[PDB]
């Protein structure tokens, strides 16, 4: 996969295929799937970090849905984005 080349742990190739088969545009540039993948990875890293912080606040080593929804609500920027 191209994820290792760009330094990502999300699927660069599959995001490109999702852009293509989604009929979003006639052509998709080579820098588009790599850019969009890094954005998705960042947000998943943000939600996991804040959700994980909630888990450790309760001495839990597991991100159950309560922690996940508790993190987004407390973080206003994510609250606006994801409600």
């Amino acid at each position: 996969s191209r994820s290792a080349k760009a330094g990502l742990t999300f699927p660069v190739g599959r995001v490109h295929r999702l852009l293509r088969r989604g009929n979003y545009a006639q052509r998709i540039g080579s820098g588009a799937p790599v850019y969009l993948t890094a954005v998705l990875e960042y947000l998943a890293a943000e939600i996991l970090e804040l959700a994980g912080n909630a888990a450790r606040d309760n001495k839990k080593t597991r991100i159950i849905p309560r922690h996940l929804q508790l993190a987004i609500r407390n973080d206003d920027e994510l609250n606006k984005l994801l409600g």
């Binding site: 979003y24 545009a25 540039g29 820098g31 890094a38 998705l40 960042y42 959700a51 597991r62 991100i63």
Partner: protein, 90 residues
Amino acid sequence: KETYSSYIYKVLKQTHPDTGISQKSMSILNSFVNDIFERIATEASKLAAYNKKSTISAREIQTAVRLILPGELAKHAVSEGTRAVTKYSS
């Protein structure tokens, strides 16, 4: 094939090596990732139909990430994307 479940585990272990994530919480997270993807993708498509262009490139995605992601998410979501497109193509 893809659900992002396998990769959300990988990202979690870099951020928190000793923390696990529940299946119902990972299903919630995949809803977030997929939703923001289809919100950046459609916005990038509109900017591509706009701009009188036929291609979706970094410019369209960065504009899409900045319109959608509020505040510091847009400023950081862009740093990651740019440093990746820079590490890529090199």
